Amino acid sequence: KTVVVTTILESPYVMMKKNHEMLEGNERYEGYCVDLAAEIAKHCGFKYKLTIVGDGKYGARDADTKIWNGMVGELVYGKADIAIAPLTITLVREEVIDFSKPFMSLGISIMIKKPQKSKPGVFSFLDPLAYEIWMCIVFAYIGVSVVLFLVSRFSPYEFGIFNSLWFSLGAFMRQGCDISPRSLSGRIVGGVWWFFTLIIISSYTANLAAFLTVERMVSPIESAEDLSKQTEIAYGTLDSGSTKEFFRRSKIAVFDKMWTYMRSAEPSVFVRTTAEGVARVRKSKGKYAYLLESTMNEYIEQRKPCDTMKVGGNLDSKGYGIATPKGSSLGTPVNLAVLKLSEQGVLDKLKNKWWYDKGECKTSALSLSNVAGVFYILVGGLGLAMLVALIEFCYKSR
Amino acid sequence: KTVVVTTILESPYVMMKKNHEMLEGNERYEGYCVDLAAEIAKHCGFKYKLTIVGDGKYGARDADTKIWNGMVGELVYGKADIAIAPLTITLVREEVIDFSKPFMSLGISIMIKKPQKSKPGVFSFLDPLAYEIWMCIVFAYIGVSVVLFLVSRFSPYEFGIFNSLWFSLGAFMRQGCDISPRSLSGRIVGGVWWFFTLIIISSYTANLAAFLTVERMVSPIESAEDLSKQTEIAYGTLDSGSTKEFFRRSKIAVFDKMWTYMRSAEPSVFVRTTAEGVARVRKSKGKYAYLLESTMNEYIEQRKPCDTMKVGGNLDSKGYGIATPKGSSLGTPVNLAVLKLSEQGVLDKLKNKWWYDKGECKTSALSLSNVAGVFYILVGGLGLAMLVALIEFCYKSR
Amino acid sequence: CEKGVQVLLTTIGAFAAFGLMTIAISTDYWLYTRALICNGGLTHSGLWRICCLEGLKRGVCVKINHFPEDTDYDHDSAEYLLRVVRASSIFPILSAILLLLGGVCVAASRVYKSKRNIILGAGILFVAAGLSNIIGVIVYISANAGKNHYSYGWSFYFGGLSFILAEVIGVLAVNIYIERSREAH
Amino acid sequence: CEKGVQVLLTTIGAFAAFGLMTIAISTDYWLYTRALICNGGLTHSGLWRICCLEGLKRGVCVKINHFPEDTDYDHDSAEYLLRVVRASSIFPILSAILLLLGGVCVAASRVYKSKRNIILGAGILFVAAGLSNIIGVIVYISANAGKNHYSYGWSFYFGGLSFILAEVIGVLAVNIYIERSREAH
Amino acid sequence: NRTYIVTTILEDPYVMLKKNANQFEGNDRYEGYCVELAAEIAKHVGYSYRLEIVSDGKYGARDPDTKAWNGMVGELVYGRADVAVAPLTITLVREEVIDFSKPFMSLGISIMIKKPQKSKPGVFSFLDPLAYEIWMCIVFAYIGVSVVLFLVSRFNEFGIFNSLWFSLGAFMQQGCDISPRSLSGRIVGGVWWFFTLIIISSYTANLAAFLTVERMVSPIESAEDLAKQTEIAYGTLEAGSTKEFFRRSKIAVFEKMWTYMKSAEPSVFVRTTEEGMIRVRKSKGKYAYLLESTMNEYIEQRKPCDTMKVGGNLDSKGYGIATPKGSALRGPVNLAVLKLSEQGVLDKLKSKWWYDKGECGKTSALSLSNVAGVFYILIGGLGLAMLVALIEFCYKSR
Amino acid sequence: NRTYIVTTILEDPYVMLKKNANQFEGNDRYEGYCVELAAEIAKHVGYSYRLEIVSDGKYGARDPDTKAWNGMVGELVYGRADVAVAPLTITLVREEVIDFSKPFMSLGISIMIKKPQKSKPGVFSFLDPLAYEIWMCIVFAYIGVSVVLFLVSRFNEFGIFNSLWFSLGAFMQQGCDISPRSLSGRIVGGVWWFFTLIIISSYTANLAAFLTVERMVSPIESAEDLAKQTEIAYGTLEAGSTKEFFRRSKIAVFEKMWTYMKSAEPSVFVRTTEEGMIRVRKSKGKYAYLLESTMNEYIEQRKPCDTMKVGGNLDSKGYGIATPKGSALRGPVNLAVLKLSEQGVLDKLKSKWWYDKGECGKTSALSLSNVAGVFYILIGGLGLAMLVALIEFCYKSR
Ligand SMILES: CCCCCC/C=C\CCCCCCCC(=O)O
Ligand SMILES: CCCCCC/C=C\CCCCCCCC(=O)O
Ligand SMILES: N[C@@H](CCC(=O)O)C(=O)O
Ligand SMILES: N[C@@H](CCC(=O)O)C(=O)O
Ligand SMILES: N[C@@H](CCC(=O)O)C(=O)O
Ligand SMILES: N[C@@H](CCC(=O)O)C(=O)O
Predict the structure, then answer these.
(1) Does the structural domain D5-184 have CATH classification 1.10.580.10?
(2) Is D124 within 8 Å of A390 when comparing Cβ atoms?
(3) Mind telling me how many Å the CA of A128 is from chain D's nearest CA?
(4) Measuring CA to CA, how many Å separate B281 from each of B106, B108, B221, B271, B274?
(5) In the CATH hierarchy, which top-level class contains the domain E4-105+319-355?
(6) What parts of the sequence cross the membrane (chains C, D)?
């Protein structure tokens, strides 16, 4: 009458309660899937005994012995009555057992060690304006100086080219150069140049605050492409997991290339359990990159230390599905339970509570590190100037 | 077996449903107090027939005939079994009937017609700085000009007093006056003055955006004091309401003065029903000011047209209380119902739904109206200047 | 070329400006807003009188209420002073008066050429006229403020061109006075 | 008073500045931060070596890891160049070198008085010394950045006074060269 | 060896009538996602398929009285069609009576709105902080200040030509070749300077207010709000599972929205998604359609491109092939679906049909477009200055 | 004609021991709100009252096993005391067994926290936007630029004394008596100008960032958060209705907080409100006390004044006199209470006991304090300049 439930110990889908040694029975384990399975036996109308698969595995078929390991093995091999787990749906597992309508969705995704907040770079003070604007600004400054020179030559009342350049430059920085135009055309050119500066500077200074302090995480990987295009950083998977099989069977260029990479890399990229891969990322100092189902990546990102991040959109879309032995009479009811729950809204609530309710993760004075670059420029120009003078002097003494 | 419930038609405490003519029975009325009374009969365990008091009144005792009108009259005069209303608790109504623990709280408060958003005034451009700062700024500008004058006289290498004033003024407005100091003390004074301006102007311009567009509602009344200190704007009440009796019996200066005012003012400030007073405010163009219980004021403020506002803190604190005839056996249970509900949290939920769930109520370019004042100043000074010159000229021609 | 043509240019500019300003005062196409008069409906409006269009009334030139626009508050609040000035329209008419008096002083300058200060007074008149007209514009706008589309009709830009001309004339008259003084030397 | 005293003041300032800068380089009280070395605990730190205090070790002067601070990313990211320069401390030592060479040129100026450009070269040396020292400060801070209290010890302000003196000396040496040229006239 | 009947519905892009379909016959009459999809499915299962539209153009639902099946489900259950390949949302009621298949596309219940005003920042967006009126009256004041200063100065280098200059430098804060020495000139300068400071500070602060604040507002932006609004219309499609979900919902917001939808006159419902689309497009912000998310996105992509999805999806479910209960075809269809998923097909088709077409394709650095009007102005002034210098050259040469 | 026993509890300011109470005996031993209150009540009812503290110093509650009454309620129910005049929160359980009275003060369940760092803006708050290091290195760069410019210029009016000037004007944007004519001088000027622009724009933008952003943050700031946090401790008082409310709550957040409180080691509870107060004061932000609101406010007012109320009140209830069930005293007491309320008394006493003492008493215009350091600086520079001019006068005269 009782039903031998299979499952796995994979947080946040299954977790033993704090002080579980002080507990015996289905109360030992708590988790999303525990809640689900309790509800399912409520709806279907039987009794369940929870069991963690002894192999600590999800499911996969030996390429030589053609045996099914883990929970799929238990179900096909009678050890188990049912599975209620983060079990993924795939063709191969259809051909031997009957799954249910996905009770939640997912993708195969990339987990990385959170790169540090890359302090705003030197030469950050250009960020508030795009690079085509500075180029246009410069063409315009040249153009103005040129036009004021031509005008002062052809139609005078002195603005050599260098002095014109100086006046324009001084007007951009709001410092009034000592020489001013005296004609009606140079005065026009100066007026429009002045308006130009007023606008440009007003805008730039309007948004200059954040840009010099903005801190942005840029990752060395942004997709599967940036993974398959490098081997400095590895990328592995769980073992006996649908992720492995999907990569193996993939007929696409990127996934096949990465499969080749990972079937021979040394030391082995693969692992035996999720948390092991989590640790490998959390210690490999960004030289590793884990390929797991999206939900784990999300929970791990929200959970402390919050030292990992999901990167790149889900390479594929899939779904987690309750399972049953082929020809079981438990397939039809578990299905309707999933549907009823999803319609009522239980699954969304659980997804929010187990993930979001687990969540554990200003205007600041400028630091010299922020505005250091300009200082360098300053000194640079000074050096240059010194040098220049010496040149001139050395030239004159000659 | 059924219980003759008394109540009143006062929104949002009691309201007939839309298409009530298509309905008969207790379903005709919907409201906060309807929900409450339904629950109360659920807990106590009897049946109720809702009834709007025929007099359309809350309760009050004739000073000559010593009769009780309205719901209090019905309860004392057997017409009614119970009252579940926005009925206020007071001594006089204790002496004849038994109230319950207040199921919600309140105060006597002032309702006003929403004054318009007073556009930021002329001379708004002083708002970003306090008035002691401008006074200190001016003392400082004078001081600087003085000190630069003394220094240029006693220790020279020309800065008359007027030219010193000019240089200082030019440096405050960031426009470089043509004359600059040449000594080491005047140069110091100029440097510190320059730093002064940089800071002051930076701050002022930092916060100048909002202040010239800020729109603030200032009301001609801010308390009972500003009511008793004027008669341009009236202040009245409901009739046969505890507010009236509280004012009448008040031994305080303000409330007694306002009671005297309102017992003789013509036309009569008082009214016969709340909504009538609401209308009187909503049309009297701010020459009227209603004194009602706080909750009505709140709901009316949230409800459209949202053309009224509560002003001044509650002159007193009171509470609404279910009532019963003196010696009734319904007093003890209704009490415990109130307590159980308040403990569970029903009353807060109702208060939120009937009030907040009824709720029906940017960076913008500058309008000339905002910055008009400075223009006037401009023209003013110009006029002045013109005039001045003429004076000088008229003096010279003499 | 400034050999006496300056004076004729001055006077024709002065009288043209006075004409534009008189038209603007005496005209009702200062605005093209939408108002709740037309039975809400398009309205070209003015300094003195609204007059609907593209509406049911379509031609009913109504006199406006400047101060009595459902006052409902703010008597002696410094808004009343603005509404007074807008309604009176004392500043535009002051500009017109001053332009007139400037033309008068210009012409009398052509007569009593012995006195030079006359033309200078004319210049001052024109200048003050301009200042007053810009104040007129400012009050008009800062009242009209009390968010639909709106627009300014040829009468507004006639006042604008009046101010332009008034300032120009102030310049030219002052230049005349300066030449006259140099001749006196 | 600038009758030869200027030169003695120049040279003593130069050698004092060189001394301060050598001390600052050769000293470890540039900082008074709290670090995870002391078994977290107070640390006075320096350009070359940390050395704990008010801790368990209380006197263990450790050599710091500048580039090998758990690099974990950002090799050849323009952070490596900064960390190189901080660790090498090439700019402070460049300042010291230049101050030394400036004193050398000053003294040789007292000898081969026939040549005037020597003192000018000395001035340039001192000036470049100052620029290099401020860069040294800047790199130090912009690395030390990689939010507890911190503070700067007498060695930092010794570098600061070194820069001050270096600039002063540049001034005085240039003034000498100018007087020398005027004498040559 | 018989062709299998394939019922479906006309909803772009899942199925559509080919351009020139009158010139086409048979299964080549229609084009759409599900067209190709059924192509591959029948290729896999090795059967021939005959396309057919559903008579009613309505998906499927049950009459509560007759308890009959309409649309595609009616066609299948009663045997008119052999297979359904269309967006046939899976739900409890439908699954009881037919055999669904593992999804092939995921979605949810979502809000569609008419696009409000873009209010896009043009190229002369640097004037917006100051109204047209202010710019006009600034020019007027410039002319006033300059003429007055000429006057008071000349009855000095303060001609008109230099006065307009001085009063143009002061406004831009770019210096002053000259400073007044007279009391009158100084009064006017000291007034223009103040006017300048106020105006410029205002302009810059409000500019920062614009640039750091772009359109980030939408009223409904959720489900609670939608259920709270009353000036708006919102409903579903008849003969589909969206109406079923709203009607059967046991949630608060959903229950209230069902109440609203079931009683709003005129009928907020429609008969075709196209009808609701055209309604919202021609609703003037007065209709907000609740439908799936796939169609919301597709509609937003295609021209007019005048709609937008809003808010997060209320729920999450999926499409699915369907077959008559107990049929022998379901197995191969499910396996085919999974094969398609693992192989990257469904992704391919979705990209082809949604994004490939593309009828319409904190701080961020300024785009040259935002501030290009400045460069237009500058160029115009340059050309004008060269022109004026040509004029002056001619005037001088003669 | 017997004095009536008056049990109560020692909780400032409701009841307290007078300073010099050892020098006092009888009812004049204690002072507090409820002291005066009982005074007026017994005055009204015309009886004599004898004050007594409750032995346990604990309000009241019921043992679940022995089903006994402790504290003041124990004293009353079992007859040890005749009346209770103290904050004796009304609730369902207590009211079953004794006769309460209409409240005399209203309150709710609220959070108390240790005050975090004030971070108050001092008088030199105008430097905060730029770190101490930046100001230092700015001075260094000023000295560098000036010395270099002297140099390149002199091997011109660019002595050192004028170079430091030129490079001081440029930084403040207040002009330049001189502009370089050399290539080297111009390179340096054009670099200082740029440095200047960046630094000043930075300073001003971040200044706006400070002034328009003051402390507006608190972590818990609600009840949901509190129930979500785990680094913090929070509990109740034993033998009171706050613990009862949390324990009996049927709400989500309250239920979870009860779970936390019932299992946290060490016991988050205390025995006296003073104990929890001293705990939070000595909790280093690690204890957050849940108690009433009256005491929260009073504690915040009195020195140390190191606490603060946070969040809105969870519920809303009231104090109340109490008497043994069935007593004959309740009526007069209720009438007295209402008389006191209508007469303005309770307000008077509350003002006297809470605010009269006062141990510690968007945009807003700047206070002179915020920016007074500028005036200190300016004055210092003035005096220094007069001093230096005295020096120069002496040096010149000799
Ligand atoms: C040189 C300084 C010039 C100062 C001239 C300012 C004179 C008049 C302008 C203010 C008039 C605006 C008054 C309307 C508001 C009010 O009622 O006070
Ligand atoms: C007159 C213009 C002077 C320009 C001088 C600027 C020269 C050098 C300063 C930049 C050095 C900073 C480089 C570190 C970041 C990087 O790796 O590129
Ligand atoms: N549920 C997945 C897990 C695979 C993974 O985590 O990569 C499976 O059964 O294969
Ligand atoms: N409930 C109050 C209403 C009085 C008022 O609205 O002013 C009473 O019974 O008197
Ligand atoms: N796809 C939906 C129809 C569309 C709708 O109801 O919104 C269904 O199969 O029920
Ligand atoms: N006033 C509370 C005691 C204080 C508390 O429990 O927080 C009561 O009477 O129950």
Answers:
(1) no
(2) yes
(3) 21
(4) 21, 16, 14, 12, 11
(5) alpha beta
(6) 5-25, 88-108, 118-138, 158-178
